[PDB]
Amino acid sequence: GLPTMNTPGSCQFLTSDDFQSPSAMPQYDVTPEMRIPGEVKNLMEIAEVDSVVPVQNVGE
Amino acid sequence: GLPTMNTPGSCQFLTSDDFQSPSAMPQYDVTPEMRIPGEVKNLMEIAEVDSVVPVQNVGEKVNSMEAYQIPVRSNEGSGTQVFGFPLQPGYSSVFSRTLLGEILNYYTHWSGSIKLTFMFCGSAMATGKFLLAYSPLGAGAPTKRVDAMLGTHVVWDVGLQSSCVLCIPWISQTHYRYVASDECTAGGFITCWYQTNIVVPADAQSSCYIMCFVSACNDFSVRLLKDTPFISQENFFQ
Amino acid sequence: GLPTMNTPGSCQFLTSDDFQSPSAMPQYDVTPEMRIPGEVKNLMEIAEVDSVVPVQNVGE
Amino acid sequence: GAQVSTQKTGAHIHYTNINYYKDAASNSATRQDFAQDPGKFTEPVKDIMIKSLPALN
Amino acid sequence: GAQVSTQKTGAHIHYTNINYYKDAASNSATRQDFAQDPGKFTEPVKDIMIKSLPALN
Amino acid sequence: GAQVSTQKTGAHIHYTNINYYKDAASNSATRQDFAQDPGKFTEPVKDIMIKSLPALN
Amino acid sequence: GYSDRVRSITLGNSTITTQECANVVVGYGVWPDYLKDNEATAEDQPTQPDVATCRFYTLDSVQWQKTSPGWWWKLPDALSNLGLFGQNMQYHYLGRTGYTIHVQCNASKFHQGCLLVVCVPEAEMGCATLDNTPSSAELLGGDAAKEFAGEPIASGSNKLVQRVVYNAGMGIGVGNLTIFPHQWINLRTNNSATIVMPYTNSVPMDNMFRHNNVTLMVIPFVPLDYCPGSTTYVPITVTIAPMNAEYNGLRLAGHQ
Amino acid sequence: GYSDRVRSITLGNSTITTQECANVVVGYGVWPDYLKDNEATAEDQPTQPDVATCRFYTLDSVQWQKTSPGWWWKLPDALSNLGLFGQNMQYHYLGRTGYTIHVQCNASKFHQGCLLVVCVPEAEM
Amino acid sequence: RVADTVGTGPTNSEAIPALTAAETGHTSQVVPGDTMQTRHVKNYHSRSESTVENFLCRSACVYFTEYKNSGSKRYAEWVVTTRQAAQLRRKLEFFTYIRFDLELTFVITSTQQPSTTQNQDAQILTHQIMYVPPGGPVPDKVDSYVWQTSTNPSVFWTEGNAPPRMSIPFLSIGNAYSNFYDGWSDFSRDGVYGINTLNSMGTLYARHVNTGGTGPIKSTIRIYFKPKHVKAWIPRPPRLCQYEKAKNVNFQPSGVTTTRQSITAMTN
Amino acid sequence: RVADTVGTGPTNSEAIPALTAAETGHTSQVVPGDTMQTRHVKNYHSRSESTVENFLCRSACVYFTEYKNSGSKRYAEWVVTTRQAAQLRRKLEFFTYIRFDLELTFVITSTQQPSTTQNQDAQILTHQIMYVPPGGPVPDKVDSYVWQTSTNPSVFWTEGNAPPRMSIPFLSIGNAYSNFYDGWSDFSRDGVYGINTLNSMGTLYARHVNTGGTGPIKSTIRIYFKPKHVKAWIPRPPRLCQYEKAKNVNFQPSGVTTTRQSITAMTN
Amino acid sequence: RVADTVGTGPTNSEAIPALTAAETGHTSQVVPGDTMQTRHVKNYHSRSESTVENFLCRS
Numbered sequence A, C: 001g002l003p004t005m006n007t008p009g010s011c012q013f014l015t016s017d018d019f020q021s022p023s024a025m026p027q028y029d030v031t032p033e034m035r036i037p038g039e040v041k042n043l044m045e046i047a048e049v050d051s052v053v054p055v056q057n058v059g060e
Numbered sequence B: 001g002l003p004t005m006n007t008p009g010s011c012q013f014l015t016s017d018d019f020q021s022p023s024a025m026p027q028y029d030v031t032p033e034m035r036i037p038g039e040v041k042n043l044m045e046i047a048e049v050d051s052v053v054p055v056q057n058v059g060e061k062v063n064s065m066e067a068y069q070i071p072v073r074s075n076e077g078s079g080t081q082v083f084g085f086p087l088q089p090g091y092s093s094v095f096s097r098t099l100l101g102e103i104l105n106y107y108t109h110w111s112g113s114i115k116l117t118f119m120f121c122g123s124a125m126a127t128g129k130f131l132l133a134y135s136p137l138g139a140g141a142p143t144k145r146v147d148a149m150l151g152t153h154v155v156w157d158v159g160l161q162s163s164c165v166l167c168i169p170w171i172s173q174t175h176y177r178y179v180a181s182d183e184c185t186a187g188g189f190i191t192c193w194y195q196t197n198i199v200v201p202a203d204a205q206s207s208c209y210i211m212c213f214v215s216a217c218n219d220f221s222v223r224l225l226k227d228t229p230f231i232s233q234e235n236f237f238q
Numbered sequence D, E, F: 001g002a003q004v005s006t007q008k009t010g011a012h013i014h015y016t017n018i019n020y021y022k023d024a025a026s027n028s029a030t031r032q033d034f035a036q037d038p039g040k041f042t043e044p045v046k047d048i049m050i051k052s053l054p055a056l057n
Numbered sequence G: 001g002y003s004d005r006v007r008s009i010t011l012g013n014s015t016i017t018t019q020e021c022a023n024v025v026v027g028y029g030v031w032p033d034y035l036k037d038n039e040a041t042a043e044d045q046p047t048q049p050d051v052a053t054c055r056f057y058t059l060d061s062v063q064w065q066k067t068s069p070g071w072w073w074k075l076p077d078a079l080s081n082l083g084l085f086g087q088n089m090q091y092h093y094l095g096r097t098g099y100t101i102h103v104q105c106n107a108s109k110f111h112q113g114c115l116l117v118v119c120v121p122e123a124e125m126g127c128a129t130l131d132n133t134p135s136s137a138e139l140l141g142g143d144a145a146k147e148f149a150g151e152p153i154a155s156g157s158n159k160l161v162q163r164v165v166y167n168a169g170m171g172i173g174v175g176n177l178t179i180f181p182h183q184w185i186n187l188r189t190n191n192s193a194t195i196v197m198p199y200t201n202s203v204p205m206d207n208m209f210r211h212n213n214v215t216l217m218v219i220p221f222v223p224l225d226y227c228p229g230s231t232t233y234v235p236i237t238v239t240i241a242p243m244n245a246e247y248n249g250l251r252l253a254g255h256q
Numbered sequence H: 001g002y003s004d005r006v007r008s009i010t011l012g013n014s015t016i017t018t019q020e021c022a023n024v025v026v027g028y029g030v031w032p033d034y035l036k037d038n039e040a041t042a043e044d045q046p047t048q049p050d051v052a053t054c055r056f057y058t059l060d061s062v063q064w065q066k067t068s069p070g071w072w073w074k075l076p077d078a079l080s081n082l083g084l085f086g087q088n089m090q091y092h093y094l095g096r097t098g099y100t101i102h103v104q105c106n107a108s109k110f111h112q113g114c115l116l117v118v119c120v121p122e123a124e125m
Numbered sequence I, J: 001r002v003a004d005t006v007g008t009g010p011t012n013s014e015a016i017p018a019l020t021a022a023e024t025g026h027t028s029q030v031v032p033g034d035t036m037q038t039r040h041v042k043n044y045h046s047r048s049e050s051t052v053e054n055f056l057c058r059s060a061c062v063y064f065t066e067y068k069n070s071g072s073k074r075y076a077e078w079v080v081t082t083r084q085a086a087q088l089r090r091k092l093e094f095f096t097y098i099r100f101d102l103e104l105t106f107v108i109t110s111t112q113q114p115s116t117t118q119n120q121d122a123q124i125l126t127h128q129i130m131y132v133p134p135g136g137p138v139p140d141k142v143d144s145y146v147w148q149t150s151t152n153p154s155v156f157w158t159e160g161n162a163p164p165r166m167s168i169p170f171l172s173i174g175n176a177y178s179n180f181y182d183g184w185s186d187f188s189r190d191g192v193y194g195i196n197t198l199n200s201m202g203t204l205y206a207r208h209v210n211t212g213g214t215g216p217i218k219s220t221i222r223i224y225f226k227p228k229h230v231k232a233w234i235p236r237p238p239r240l241c242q243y244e245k246a247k248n249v250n251f252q253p254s255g256v257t258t259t260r261q262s263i264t265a266m267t268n
Numbered sequence K: 001r002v003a004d005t006v007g008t009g010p011t012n013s014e015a016i017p018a019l020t021a022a023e024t025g026h027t028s029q030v031v032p033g034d035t036m037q038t039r040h041v042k043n044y045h046s047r048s049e050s051t052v053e054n055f056l057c058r059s
């Protein structure tokens, strides 16, 4: 048994945390990927596309 | 699962601890750095800068700008004492509020030499000679000019350059002297005397003033950082 | 998170234990050492020195 | 088989990661995948158009 | 990629540190950065002044 | 930078130790320092005396 | 041969010549310079009026009296209505510039006085009333000096800068103003003080009207005093020259 | 640059600084020095207190009046009860030493006066 | 390492190290040896505790607030400000501009509150802390959709273990944090004046995830700030005054220093 | 390793190993073989438990104090002194000068105190320990600003886990700690006389961070000292007397040894 | 890393960057420099929080 210390914040839950956890099912065979059009890698690319502006946004 | 033991003190909170913890936001893009003047890397560099000394800190004088000024006047007999203050910067009232003293109130131990700078503020015609002396601990404070001369001293002459530097050598049995006053370590006594009477022409003022500046020397150092005595809050501010 | 087991005796206090613990003050500058006479490395060396014996330890 | 990668830092420093599971679905997310290409959504049209030419000629 | 550095010790001894996060903001503080330069605050003036010459001439 | 040292064993076997702190005051005690010299306390006198010679001559 | 005391500074079409001066002080050892492309947030090209903006401008003089607590000027406000430089800032949303400060006082050998000339970045004055922030008119004086008061402002329920001299308005000790770049004018030894300031600010460029970068303050540690029949009026004059001034965000004139 | 008039003399823990001074005078062109073995009559080793004895000592000041005939001091008697140097001579039968003399007077430009500072060997009154 | 004194011997010379000019403003820099004879001394002293990082690398409690498992005040909200604690504020004030990563430790303690109800059973309380960026919707009630935190960083803590800990990247629109701002919020100059104008760090909300027992429970959450990777510029004098508000630097006027009986006397 | 005896055979000689002089003060150093015939024996014995570090590398309780969650005495203050515990004091006294790093373990136990109040509910107590350097402001009340500890080292402990542990660097103005000082605090020599003159290690304060239940709770904190990296010089005789004060070495006079019936008798 | 603007100088030309057709449906792609004189600015800004994984990697 190697000696170990426990850091403050042990056993705490953070929404934005990145860690390794054990899979519910061992060795599952995932369905093969297929080619799909309009693949998205960044949100900014969607914002570059022009959008109609409701400039006359008054009343009716 | 590797076998592990838990050390005593696991799950404890220490103010001064250095560890690695997970960021609240992953992969944040920090704003780029830009060049700024007067960059600071050490507190000591701020203490090296001279600070005006409220030597005349008596009664109403602290309330006016008269605290900093030290009174001098032409006198019938040479040998009168201009002023006397305790050597230590941290505990003494005279040096407690200065740049170096304020930094010291933060640290428990202090080490090294202090430079004191004195600038005459009288008319061009006015002339005079003063004796600035430091007396080593364990000797009663000097009561006469002859006693003061035994302690290491610099004789200053007004005219030509108008400022003088008396540098107090560190003379301590210990490597470090406590900022808080200590019976064991006594820093010393610093006093000023008239080497000669001030002389002025008719139509020139008999009485002038002398400002004092205090700073950390190159050899100066600090340790055991502690909370400062002056700052306190009854309640959180709004 | 690597899997770990806890040994029996975890979180226990032993008088004669040798472990690594975090300093109360970080990066303190310790006062320099100086030469002192009669340095001691072993208790036995003190016992080698002769000691007067109260052989007549009776009454007054 | 330890893997050494760069960390997220400012401009104008490496973190070690070891996989302890074989499911491959137990790994961390691929946050550092900074690749973008607006060519699909913007400039969809077949014939290419130059920045400064009449759009219709 | 372990890094080996010197420890804080007296005068008149190495500690291993490994980064387990990529945020780079999760690292320990840089306590050992003992660099100082009073030239900015003290001796600010353009023309350099020698230690033992009349200050004004 | 792991350090390998011998263990305390009987007569008539190595332990690995790694420092995880830089304070240097956080290290374990130096139990294995078996050095002794009674010359200071015993045989203090300037002129050396042989084991079998008259003590005063 | 030459004299350390004699100096001559030439900026634009204005030349300053003092027979006696203390060595010139660069506050952080940095000369003022135009902004780097690497560090520049704004895409649009900047406009540099060159010599027009970069010339000495002389402000209204003040009278040094035996009991004057102090005089203080907000520098950006000081040059806000003076020549092309006042016009350019009113026209433009963003401006960054270096500042040259020159404080001149003349007295007879018999006169004795000591003035402290200190330029302080981001000085924030504090109102006499705790619940109210200080008024703009009290905070900045355009075309006129603002004067420190020896006594603390009396009890009040109105906007009013706290002017007590020892606090200097910043609620900090007057003696520790040494850390800020400064130059001492002693009547026996010095005729005038020259301080050169690098541009200082967190942002590379800032709107001049909303925000003021540095504040020139003059306080006499030692009171002026003279024997009878000597000149009883002493004049202190502040001359300020912009350095490497540049402007961006061409906009219609005026601030609101 | 430098000024002929400005001077600074440092002996032991005492430093003297005068903005204006006449050129320093060495009386016979000879610096004071320790005695030679070739010239030494006494067999016993001498004791040299070094910086203790060798420091500036300040005497009681006098008042210059419009009619003061003169002021005179016997130098060995002057330092006979001052610091370690007064103590060493009282303890020891024989003493030989060099002497540094510094006479300081301060007056306004308008003042006018001339003082003669002379050191005379073997003056017999 | 501290500079070590050089041994010196007596000399008479034209040169005048002790003499200098205050008017130039160049601080005099003279060693003890120039003023007096000295002996060669080596110094092993280290300036390693005066570094800005060491001075500002210690946890301090910026603020604490109380919330109740029952009754009207279900959850506590605090705007995130350094100024409300004097010790943290004074040290930060020492530099005009500071750049630094932030380390946050939260300590939560629950105290039972006396009540008329009897035979209470208390399951372990779980506490949720949620941080909202400017313009994120504020919760109006403890049971709100805002408590889901899909787009908001949030931590859940179970009583009886190490306090939750997080690291914060340097967050500013500006290149550096500004301790003092001499400016108005608007171009006109009529409006609030102060550092409060550049104050937009968001708000923090704390609530009981669950109620273990019928009796009233009050929980105090304490927030601790530790600067990391510190970078400073433009140093400022010591404040020298007690604080009055966290939104302004307004001060009651203060004497320069404590007063001794006489200029000659060595007693404070 | 222990020295191993050499085998010897009978001889008649001028040389006299057994004969020696006590007056010189050089301890006699003669092997068993010189006095009698001996046989060659190898020794595997090791002097590895007599080392100063092994002798002084074990935790001992220097002192313990009690504080109450309610009532007038909210927190406990103890000045940090080695002398108040006899076992720690006696072993330290064996060397006149000692240099050593300090290891500190605090054990806190809370006991419920009987009371008239009923149906008490107790949330887990959290305990704060804060160490103040000489001249740091002392807390005057449990709710003081001093408890923020921005400039002061401090530890927070939650009941039910390993005791908090810290390492201390060698703290002294002096090169070595002085077990005995033959000196006065002042030059005059009128004043306190003793080791207490060199005593300035600071003070330690312990308080309940929170109160779980209405009933009174008393908590005892025990402080444990373990020397590390030990270095000793100038060894001193065994004390041979019961202690009386921790500020002085004053002693009631003591007989040299326990007394047997007669010089001839082998019975104590 | 975000694209960095290129410095531009005044010119009179047949070419018409600002003019374009909405009907084609090809989004117009014109830099600030084409519409007005600009100064060379380097950008250290990073599109590292707009990635789909970062946007959807939170509980």
Ligand SMILES: CCCCCCCCCCCCCCCC(=O)O
Pocket: B024, I080, I081, I082, I102, I104, I129, I130, I131, I153, I154, I155, I166, I168, I171, I177, I178, I199, I201, I202
């Ligand atoms: C997820 C919970 C924690 C949320 C933390 C939010 C970020 C707080 C950052 C505060 C930085 C304060 C910097 C000094 C004062 C100032 O410049 O405003």
Ligand SMILES: CCCCCCCCCCCCCCCC(=O)O
Pocket: C024, J080, J081, J082, J102, J104, J129, J130, J131, J153, J154, J155, J166, J168, J171, J177, J178, J199, J201, J202
């Ligand atoms: C943060 C909590 C722990 C605080 C520990 C403060 C330092 C205590 C050091 C005590 C050393 C005692 C050395 C032997 C006796 C003596 O020489 O005074």
